[PDB]
Amino acid sequence: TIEERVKKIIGEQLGVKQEEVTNNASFVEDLGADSLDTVELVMALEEEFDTEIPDEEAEKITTVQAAIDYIN
């Protein structure tokens, strides 16, 4: 499903545990993903669901909950 495909992408693009990645887990502070890591995370999220996102609306996404919210 989408709400777990997001976890599939996030865990394997940041290397963090599945338990760590909750809905409210922010990438930078909780998951530790920095500038380039978050860039690669958004690219992977785009690839998984074969869609595209605007630059500003994409950069607005900075959390698992926000990630799914834009994805779903």
Binding site: L36, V39, E40, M43, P54, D55
Partner: protein, 50 residues
């Protein structure tokens, strides 16, 4: 005392320096390839959007 310590130091230093030279080089090679392809992708992305 000197004769002991000097030896010890020589071996320490040689191993350290050669091992770091051996590993860090390829680690940076990988990091640089990834950086390069990411940069190309971002340039392509921005140009496509514009």
């Amino acid at each position: 005392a000197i004769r002991v310590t000097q030896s010890d130091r020589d071996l320490f230093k040689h191993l350290i320096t050669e091992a770091t030279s051996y590993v860090s080089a390829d680690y940076m090679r990988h990091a640089n390839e990834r950086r390069t392809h990411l940069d190309e992708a971002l340039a392509l992305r921005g140009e496509l959007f514009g």
